[PDB]
Structures are given as C-alpha cells and as structure tokens.
Design a protein around this ligand. Sequence first.
Ligand code: SF4
Ligand code: SF4
Ligand code: SF4
Ligand code: SF4
Ligand code: FES
Ligand SMILES: [Ca+2]
Lengths: 588, 905, 145
Amino acid sequence: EPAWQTRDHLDDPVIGELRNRFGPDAFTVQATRTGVPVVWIKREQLLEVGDFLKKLPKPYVMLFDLHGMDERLRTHREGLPAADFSVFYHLISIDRNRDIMLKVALAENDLHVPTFTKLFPNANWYERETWDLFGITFDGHPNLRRIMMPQTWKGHPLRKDYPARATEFSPFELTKAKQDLEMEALTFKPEEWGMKRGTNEDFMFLNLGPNHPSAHGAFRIVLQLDGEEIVDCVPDIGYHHRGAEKMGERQSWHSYIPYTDRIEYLGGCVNEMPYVLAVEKLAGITVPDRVNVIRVMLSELFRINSHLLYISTFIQDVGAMTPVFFAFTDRQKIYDLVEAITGFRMHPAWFRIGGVAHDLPRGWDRLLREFLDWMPKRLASYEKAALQNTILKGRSQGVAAYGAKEALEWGTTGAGLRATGIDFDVRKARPYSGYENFDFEIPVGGGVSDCYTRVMLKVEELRQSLRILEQCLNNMPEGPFKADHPLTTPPPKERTLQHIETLITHFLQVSWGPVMPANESFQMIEATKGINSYYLTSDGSTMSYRTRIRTPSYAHLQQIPAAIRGSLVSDLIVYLGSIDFVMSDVDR
Amino acid sequence: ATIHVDGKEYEVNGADNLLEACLSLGLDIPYFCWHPALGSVGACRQCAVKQYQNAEDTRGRLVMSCMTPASDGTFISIDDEEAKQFRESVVEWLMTNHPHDCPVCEEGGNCHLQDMTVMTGHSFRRYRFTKRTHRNQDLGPFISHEMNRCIACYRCVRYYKDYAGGTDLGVYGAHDNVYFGRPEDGTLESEFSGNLVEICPTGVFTDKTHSERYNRKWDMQFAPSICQQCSIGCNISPGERYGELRRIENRYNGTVNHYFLCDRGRFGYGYVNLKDRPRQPVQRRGDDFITLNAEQAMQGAADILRQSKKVIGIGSPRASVESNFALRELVGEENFYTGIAHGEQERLQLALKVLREGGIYTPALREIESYDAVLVLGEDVTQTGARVALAVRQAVKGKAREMAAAQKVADWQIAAILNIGQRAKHPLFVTNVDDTRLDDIAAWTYRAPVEDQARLGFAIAHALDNSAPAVDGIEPELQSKIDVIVQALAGAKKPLIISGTNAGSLEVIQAAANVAKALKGRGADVGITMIARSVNSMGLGIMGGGSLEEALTELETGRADAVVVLENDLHRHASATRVNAALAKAPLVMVVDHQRTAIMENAHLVLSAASFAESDGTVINNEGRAQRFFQVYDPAYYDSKTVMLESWRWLHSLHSTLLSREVDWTQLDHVIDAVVAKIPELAGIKDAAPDATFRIRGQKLAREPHRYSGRTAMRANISVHEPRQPQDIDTMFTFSMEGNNQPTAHRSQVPFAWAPGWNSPQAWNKFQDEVGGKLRFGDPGVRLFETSENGLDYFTSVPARFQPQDGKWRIAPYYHLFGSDELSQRAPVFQSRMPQPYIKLNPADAAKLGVNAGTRVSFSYDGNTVTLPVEIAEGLTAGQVGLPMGMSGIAPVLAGAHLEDLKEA
Amino acid sequence: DFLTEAHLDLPMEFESIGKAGSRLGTALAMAVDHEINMVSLVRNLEEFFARESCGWCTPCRDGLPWSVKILRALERGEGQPGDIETLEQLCRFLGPGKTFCAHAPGAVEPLQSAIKYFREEFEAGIKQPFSNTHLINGIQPNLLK
Ligand code: SF4
Ligand code: SF4
Ligand code: SF4
Ligand code: SF4
Ligand code: FES
Ligand SMILES: [Ca+2]
C-alpha cells in the first residue's frame, strides 16, 4: 500500500476508545489522504471529546492546529455531515506519535462553537484567527477580537464570497487611519486588549513597534509595566498579513509554489517541500529516490542558511556586531550554490509536483565540496567569538525559561520543544522525503528551554545538517529528477518539446492547471524554525479549495506572554532574538 | 433501469445508452465519435467499459458504452484496469499521427482531444515512426481547415450530412488516409456550417473570424447574451478580449438552440468591432462636430427638448424592450412611433394576434423537431429563421425515427435508424416565390407569387374544413396537389404550420392562421410558428405604437419639432428621400445609436449607445419568449475617454434631466419594474433573469474563467497603475473571475461552460441535468403569453390570383442569410460571403425585354433609378422581378411593391 | 492463426482447429517452409491487413500501421526494446469486441501465433537500443530508469 492511499484509520486505537466512551453513533469517521484519523464530532460533545483525549493513558497533549473551512461551495462532500462551515482541531499525541483531526460542522446561521482555551491555551490566537477570517464566534473566549485584519475591517476574508483581489486605494482611508494611529497612544484602553486594572496607577503602557530595527519583521507589543518589570503583555500581530491561503484558493496547484516560498522567507525550499508533498499525496505520486535526495539537499542547505542568520542576529541583538558579516559571507557561499542549482537566491520556486524544475547542473558537487570544507572552521570561529563569551551567556542563560508542560500546552515546536527535553522531530518520528536513509542525530536539551539552550541546540542542528549534506554529496542516485506520473507538473521539457502527448499534458497543466481529484491531504515537516504543515482540501478542480498553512512562529509568539511574565524589557529583547521567528511566518 | 457502475447502484433511463447515462450521473467516460444530438455510431472506440454478466463475475468483457443500452440490472466498470488500459491505448493510437501543433492551433485550451488525452493519463510517447500528413483546403471565409489534426471520429460528416442536410462535405480515401472535407476547394454551402468548429473535437475546423484576432478560452470575458441577427433568439456566449468582441460561441439552451447556431449568428458579430462606431456623444454645431461627455450632452439635449413644442420618438426592433420603453417614457405614449412601416407593422401585429390570441400552441425551437408534418407558407425559413429550418429537417427525419422505433431499435442507434428509414420522411410542403434550401427534403414546393401562395393556403384550409372560405379558380393539377397536401396534413398526429412577416403579404399570414384553425377544429395537435424579422420585432409589436409613416408625416407637417431616433437607420422602412427631407425639416434630430448610420449627417445630436456586447436588456423572440442578454465588457475599461452607455440608460437620464433638471442614470431592474408596471403585456420580462442582488451562496457570477491572465499587464501600455475593476450594478454578473461558475450552481444563466477536465464545449454535459436534455435548473427565458382558451375566426379576405400587368413589375422578395439582416452586412467578413446584388428575371420576361443573363437593367423606385445585373430565375413566375431584400439600396419594405420602367441601361 | 507440425494430425473441423488455438476459416490451408522468414511473412500479412482497413474505427486503422512499421523495423534489424511487447499489446487490444468489425482480430491472429511459436525470429530483429528522443541543447533530459 502506498503512502498516499486513502485510509479511514478505523484500526487506530483512538477510534476504538472513542467508540467505547461516547458510542458508535456519536461521530463520523472520514476517509482522507491526510494520514491522520479525521473524526466529525457533534458540537455539543466537543469539549467532552477534548477532555477525553486529554485524559487518555497516552494523552493527546498538544493542540497542533485549529481553524475553519467554508464548505458552502464544496460539491464533493460524500460521506460527510451537512455543513455550511466547519472547524477543525488537529491534536498531536507525542507519546503515541499519533494525531487526530476533530471536525465540527456548523450551519450558516448558528456560527458559534464552545471555546477550546480551557483545554489548550493556544486556542486563544487560533480561535481569534478563525473568527477574524471566517466570522465564527467562540463562546467563552476571553477577548475575541480581530488578529490579522484591523478592528475596523468589514467582512471576513477567508469566506468564499469575499473577493480575493485588492480593492482600489483611497488616500482618505489612509489619512483617517493615520488619525487613529495618532490617537492610539492617547485613547488606549486596556479592556480592548484583554488587560485589566490598567493605569493603582503603578503601571505604564509601552509600545515597541511598529517597526523594529531587526530582520524578523515589523510588529507591536504592548506591555503593562511596573518600573522595569513586565506584568502583562499581548503582541499586536497582523502587520505582515499577505492572504496566502486566500491566494491558494485563486492559484492553480502549480502556480502557487512561489507563494509557498514567501511564507518563511528564510526557508525557501524548506517551505516548498510540505506543499509539494501534500499535492503529490493528492495526485498519488511516489517520487523517485534522486528527487528525495535532491529535495533533502536543498532543504538542509536552506536550513543551514536560516540557522546561520538566526545565530548572527541573536549575537547582534546581544551586542556583538562583528560575526554577522562573516556569517553573511557564508550565506553568500550557500547562495552561490543555490543560484547554481535553482537559478535564484532566496525564493528558488524550484520544487515541482512530482520532482524538481531542472536536473542538477554539471558541477554542483564541486560547489558543495567547497562549501562543506569551508563551513566547520567558520562555525568554530563564531562559537569561540560569541557563543562561549561570558557576557553573552549572562545575557542569555536563564532568560525566559519554560519546561515540557509549557511547551506542550502552547504548541511550541522545534528548538524550544527539544530544549525542554522532549525528543520530537518530524524527520525521525514521522519521516518524509526519504529521511530514513540518512544517518543524523536529533539534539535535545536538559529539560529547561533557555535562550542559550535553544541557540546551542540550533548550532547542533546546523552540525547535523552538515552531516546530512555530506551524506547527500557522497551518495546520490543516478536517475530521473521527475516522476513517471501523468500528473507531474510540468512534464520533462525535452519530451514536451518533441512529443505531442507530452506537449498536450504540458499545455493543459500550465494553462488551466493540473486536476487533483477531490481529497484532503496533509503534510507535516520539520521547518527551519519549528514544525510546518500544509493542509490541502481539493474539490476536484485545478485550484485548491482550501489551503491551510500551520507555522510554528504563531505558537512561539503566543507563548511570548506566558514565558516573559515577571521579567524585564531587556529579557524581552533577548527572548525575541532567541525565538527564530519571522513575521511572515506568523501572519502569512 | 438499475445499473451498477464500479459496485455503486444507480437509477437511469433504460432507453438511453450507457455513455449518456453515465455522463448524466457525473461519471467520466472518454468519448470522441458520440454526440448527444447525433447519436451513437461506435467509431472512435474510446468509450470502452467492462461489462459483467451478473453480480458475481470477474472476467467481464470490454463493451462500447455508447453502443450498449443501459438496461435494467446492468453491471459495468469504468475504472477497471483493462478498460483504462484500452482507453489509454485508443488515445495513443490517435496520437501516433497527431501533429506537434498545440501552440499554433486555435483549438488549444478548448480541445476535446487534449482533455481526453490528459484524462486517460497518456503522456508518454513510445511511437518512434513517421506521422501521416494531409494537405488543407480553402473552405471559405468562416471555417479554417487543417486536416493533419483529424482523429477520424466522423462527427463532421455525420452532423453536416445526416443532421444539417448539407451536400458538399464528405469523407474520402481509405484505411488511414481518410480525408474529411469538400470534394474541391470552395466555400461550405450550408447555412449551419459554423457548428463544425464545436462539433469537431480537434482543430481541423476552426473559427477563422476568431482566428484573425485569436485568444485562448481562459483569456475570454464571456457573457450570456441573445443573438441579435434575427427573431429566433438563439442563446449565445459572446467572448471578448482587449476591448473587442472576439468570438460568438453557442450557449446551450435546451428549449431553443441546444447545440447549434446558424452562420449569421456565429459570424455576423463583426459590426461590434467597427472603428467608425460612435464612442462619445457628439453635438453638431454648424459644420463642427464637437464632442461632449455624458452630463453636458444630457443637459444640452434636455434644454433643447424643453424648448421644443412636441418631441416624437421613433423606436426600432433592433433595440431591446427597455430602450423602446425608455424612449416611450421620454416622448410620451401618444408620441411614440415604432420604426417599421405601416404594412410591416400590420403584418407583425397580425402575426402577434395569431400567436397570442389564435388558441394554437406556438412551439419552441426544440419542440419543432417532434411534429409529424410541416407546411411552410410564404416564408423563406433558411434565409430568415435558419435554425427553424434545421429543426424542420429533424422533424422530417422523425418518420425514419418512428419506423425504426416500431422495430424495437434504440433511438440512439442512428445508423440502424437511417438504414430502416431509407428515404421515407415526414411530409414537408414549402411555398415561396422561388426555390428554397429546404427543397431537397420537401415533399412538395410551390413556386408562386404571395397572392397565389395565400390562395393555396386558403384552399387547403377550405378542403380541411368546409366552413373556411373557399377559393374559386383553382386548376385541376393545383387541386390535385392541394388534396395531396390535405391528405398528408389530416393524417398527421402533430401538424405544424410555419409562416411569417418576411413574405410581405398579410394574406399569407391569414391563410396560415386559417389552416391552423382548420387543423385545430379536427382535433389535431397543430402548432403554429411565425417568423419575425429583427431580434425584438415581437417586443416592439407587443409594446406597439404608430408607424414610421405617421412619424414622417408629423415631421413634415411641422407638428413635431424634435425627433429622437433610437437604434434605427430609417432607410429600411421608408424611402431615403422622404426620410432625408423630413429629418432636414426637423429643427432637432437626435440619434441614439451604436452603428454609424446615414441619418447622422443631418442629426443635431448623436448619442453613442451600446451594442448588445456592451449593454444589458431584454428581447422577445419569435415564439414570444422574453430573454435577458447581459453586458460582456466595459467599453471604458481600456479607453477611458469612451462614453458609451445603454440606450435605456441614455433615455432615462434624458427624461430625468428634462423633468427635474438633474441627472439620474438608472439601475436596470428599475427599468424592468417600470416596464412590468406600466405595460401588463410585457409583465413577464421580470422572470427572464434574476435581479442584480441574486447571489450563489453570497457570491456573484463570474464572467471570465478563473485562469484569466494578464491582469497586471493588459492595460500597462496606457498606465502602469491597474485601474478599478468595473462594477456591474445592473446585473448579477461581475466583470472579473471573482464569481461562481459551478455546474451545480442553482442558476439558469451560464456565461460559458467549463468543468475541471472538460475544457471543450463538452463541459455542457456537466452543466445539464441529463446529457442532451435541458439545463439542470431549467432553461433561461420565459414565455410572455400562454395559449388562448378560444381561437380567432376564419379570415374571409381571400385575394385574387396574381395578374401580370403591363409596364409594372411585382417585387418578389429574395432573402439571404448573409446580407438581409441590417447589422450583419456591416461585418467586414460578410462582404466575401454576401452575393453580388442581382435582379431576378423570369426567362419569358427577360426574353420579352431582350436582356440576357448578366446584363445591367435600370429601374426607378420612388423616383430613384438604380441599375443591377440580371440573373435568370427559372422558378420565378412571369410578371415578377426578384430583388434581394436588405442589401445596399434595396430596403426590405420593397417586398410586394410594384416596379416601373424596368429597362436595360 | 499459424499452426506447427504438431497440429498437422488434426481433423479439419471448426471445433478441432478452434480448440488448437486457430480457426478452420475457409479451410484452404497454406504451408510455410523453412526458407520463409516468419517476420517478413507476418509483415506481408499485416501490410495487407493495414492497407485493406476501411478506416471506420481507431484500433485497426491506427494500430495496424504501427504493427506494420514495427515489423518493417524488425525485418532490417532496426528493432528496439519494447517492439515485441507493443506487438503483443496490439494483439490483445485488437481482439473481438474491441474493434467495430472482425477484420482486425483476423489481422492480429497470425501476428500473435507467430510471436507465440517463432519468437526467436522476432527477437533477432531487435538490435538498436530504444531511442524516441534526440538531444536538445540546454535542457537536461529526464533519465528514466
Ligand atoms: S487539435 Fe487539439 S491536440 Fe491537436 S494540435 Fe490542436 S489543440 Fe493540440
Ligand atoms: S475533421 Fe474533426 S469532426 Fe471530422 S472526423 Fe476529423 S476530428 Fe472528427
Ligand atoms: S437563427 Fe437567427 S437568432 Fe439563431 S443564430 Fe441565426 S441569426 Fe441568430
Ligand atoms: S476493424 Fe473493421 S470497421 Fe474497424 S477500421 Fe478496420 S475494417 Fe473498418
Ligand atoms: S463514443 Fe463510443 S465508440 Fe466513440
Ligand atoms: Ca451595464
């Protein structure tokens, strides 16, 4: 049985436990290509099912995702409950290495679900984003305001009847918005943002944004302060919203790949991989081995690039401005190899449905060998220059520390989750893209996630990525760079240029789009900054019916208030430098 | 019937074959040679499914789903491995010889062969040998020929010969050298040869007029419109790119014009793209032609109209219901004049009275194909209402259909039906002044003047019913033919009588009404069809008004010092000298029009109105069905200086500026409400299409496909800043791809057909409830009237026989599909197709005048001597001269007029 | 279908020849000696059958010339791997019920019988490696394995 085969997952023990607890008629099991059991639960039993999953012998401890879907235009809904809208809850059990997708069906008039925040605190921002983009009200939410769009925004953009394209610009709207930007400091009310007891009169309100002098993006944090002590803080995000999901509903399966590049713009091919993997799951494509090793090579190269930039920016935020120049020279070496392979520096747009855009250029191994010889001495130099310095250690150790429980309840993944002592990497637990054929280690922490522990874990991850790159250079199969499937978009170019059936396939795939049959697919990968995921719903057309991108920087920014509570502003700056987030990843 | 496809049970129609039954269920089977309108032949061998004998069976057998009936308890599989392998192999065999031509082929992105190559999953070529090659032929100005792309699916020959009755397209050659085309280079003679570009699943037959300015299907902006070239009202999809009307595709209507248009509607659109059209309002001051915007034109016209003592309005059957009603509201009901002559209006009102008061059910265009005998009186259907002639051909083949059904032969087995019914056909009796294009299938043809055809009709009605008025003076041979017609009509279960206003005689319409009443009195299921002239002739007849002669009399007498002419050239309904004198005497002439007409040289004000591609409105076709047509594109999107509005918008704004001295343009639904509130006869036009607030789950209807391209570069040569998307406040459609065009959307107006995997016109199968039937949620268009409870009385006004008087010549009308409609001659592709302007002469009259064939003769009509070359017409009765109606210099009002001093120049 | 010398002791009935993997037909047998190359004989047969196609239906009309070209390539030793497999697939997909009439099953009967009984003559024509594509400068080919 192939990995893309449609499975109902009725042999999962979670289905049997749910049947024994709630009854055989309490839910509907859906057969998908997501790889996880999809269970449609009634709305009135949602909190009961969540509590039952939370109190399992090997419980589902992390709310991985929570969002909505507009099901009004979905023609192929066979074996599904009648739904105008739906809300899905993706929960991960690390102990079982399993996950379950609960789904709640809502009518068009009764668009309200009970809040999930009493079970999982990340449901705060997840439900705020669901309300902002779909208009679904969550009863019991502490403060259900818009998180992506401004508060004075009419309509909900991810609904099907909302126009995707840009409206006409008016200087009047900009000028009045400048007026509210002017009186926002004067007319600030903490009750709007969920804060309480604002201005006792021992607290002051501090706004860091909107523009920070850093490469992680532009955003605001409002802080309740007693002197230099932070008591309450909520981040103001949505300043980097690009409508990537709404764009996914109006681009074909092939023409959306450059938009998948700019989700985490320090990731590139790392961001391209889960999307093309989920599309290949929809298409029923098993890629050959050379495609797997090429994609692994480019993903590890871009992971090293992102980790180098993150370590450099953390060192610069500490105060040492020297190693960022040398590490950007190293990034220039990586960019030289990436320019040679894909033709571009930062957003290659090189992964394809079924393979990659071109074969590897003649001489890639030379550039890879020079880069692999160049890296370790520079890494040791950066280590001895800044990451073994006592001033950097005093600035970074013990700042914004959290344990395994806090990382599990807030959906923190990547360096922080492994620094809390939990060994969970997608490249080993749920392997993808032929990662089982590479010998590499997963670094883990002692059990407490400091800034320093996360930075050293990222350094060890860079070392392991260098090991993977060495294995890619030494052992590469000789064969096709595209699959032997009719849905490989585009087909190989020489056969397009001299065969007429291949020309027909190329013509209809680049113009109208490749036709993915109606199914739901899900791919979860380990990104450069945590765990990334693409959830793609196809209605049988040439475009995505629903593109849902889960990014870890959302969860990290939501964990920001729970970890910095009771600390200083400089601790907040060091924490922001030690998260490895981009605002495009948060806001997408 | 009960069938089981891939283990899933379905209920289908047992009289259908498995291919159309499974396509109606939403299942996908590739097919080439089968068509819903043409039946099954089993040629392309593409639709192979695996049939099993019973519920438990593992071997099966590859059967042909188009050739296999969907009987009760059938077991088939589509996704069987052997069936899929064979379908991919059939695609591969078709692709062995196919040219590497998709980038330079006009069927690219619209190709059924491309769709089925992709859908079978064939993308790898292992064939390494040569590909066969064919030379091409010149098929005329409309169809472009490329025989290399043929897959030998035999659709073209089957449609063109068996369905459309054409004789000049066939299949030649042998084993793999089969050639589909004409026996020699020449124009395709059929009036329905344009449907080959949709019948052909490949790019062998392509729209050449579209090919001149070619763009792909995904790049088109489509709208659901009504063809404006005669009164049949065929549903069309005009598609636009870069501010010009690019193509007319057939839009499916299961009640009117299901899969097929005629060549006048498909290739006569080129007047929209003419460069001499008015794009701005123009005011004539002395010798200068100054250009205004909309507001100053409205203010100036309102001021001058307010100073006038009486403003009259001359409508037209070209304009929609809303434009005519807005003109009627602006000038007043008693000052509104229909733009047609007195005789044309009298014939139109009589045909309307017969239709909506005669008690006989008038059929739709699809319903015509089920009648058992057809009598066409006076009307040249193929040149005036061509789609009715096609439906008459199908009704004639109905006898072979019945003969094959009597032998338990399935109705989709077209070859067996044609073999059983060899040459037996339902009776067709056509009367005209000469031979018609229906004569190859007609049981009898009567070449006689209009009075003699009316007398023949009155005699048929008297022989059917003795209470009908009798005709004295019938020859014994003509009486024998009369009783042959009467015996054929009386034995028919469903007789159909077709007449119209194009014969130029009231008595022909009266005789057809008498025949229909006599057949109704015998208990027969008689239907009556009346063919009008223009797109909204029925609408102008229902709304009514004075004739053009009364308007010219008011202008000449000085009682009217202001005339507003709406979408009328005024020369097809009256003499040019009289119109020019009356318009020159008027101190204000104001022409609201979208085509540069000859009456704008004396016009004081010209309003740049919109054509059907740039306007919304309602038109009433010949059967009395109200149909809404929608705007295709915004003319001001590309050229921002273009101020071209709807005619009803112009006239409503003029009425508002005349009354309240303020400008209000309108919304379209406001004008629709005004029409249905003030004219109860036109109250049914509200249900023709839903209002502008109609949504499909909250979103509008997309005009263009979702892969519409060039949004940030197509206007970049003017300005790099992208403009506002045009807002359509009038209708429910949006000028963007941000809309709904789902096949399952609860709507009736479909701008274009597209399904994922079905890019060709075969996506209409996805847009129908059953394949070849109606649309899923009904067809657009609502009949304005029901059939009457009681009929009329017999028309006792029997005319005398035609007497050829000396020194005078009766003008026999000759109509052409290319040349008689006013707007179609303006299309520059038609001048290569329109015939040379002739004059038809009987051999005895030509010998009496000493003129041969081809010599020039000069005749004076209304004191205007024009010369034409002589063509000898054998079937024309003596004492008559035949003139081509609607051409240059020959108005259609000249039908039945007398001609003086016809003499060789 | 071609029959070997082992089938020579069989009565000339419909059932007996039908049970041997052939047909009685017109019962006018034709004898092939050792001097006749089976590939050339089957090429002559298929050339007749391809040029006497009526052109109505796709498998015979567009698949018999493919078999003709394959057998012509095998005649001069220009056959490539996949040719005999293509001939066998053509024999399976031009059987009874797959074409509009019974001309193409009779066309592919000698080809499948000669491939069954004399495969060593068809394998002798496959000399050149398979090449459907030529090199295009600047585009690296997709080297399928
Ligand atoms: S007819 Fe179809 S397959 Fe052939 S060249 Fe044209 S678009 Fe391509
Ligand atoms: S010309 Fe077109 S319609 Fe005619 S047989 Fe060939 S592919 Fe079919
Ligand atoms: S029959 Fe009349 S309405 Fe129909 S396509 Fe022809 S001209 Fe247009
Ligand atoms: S199998 Fe028969 S029907 Fe088909 S093309 Fe060959 S000879 Fe004609
Ligand atoms: S569609 Fe049935 S054989 Fe052609
Ligand atoms: Ca409009």
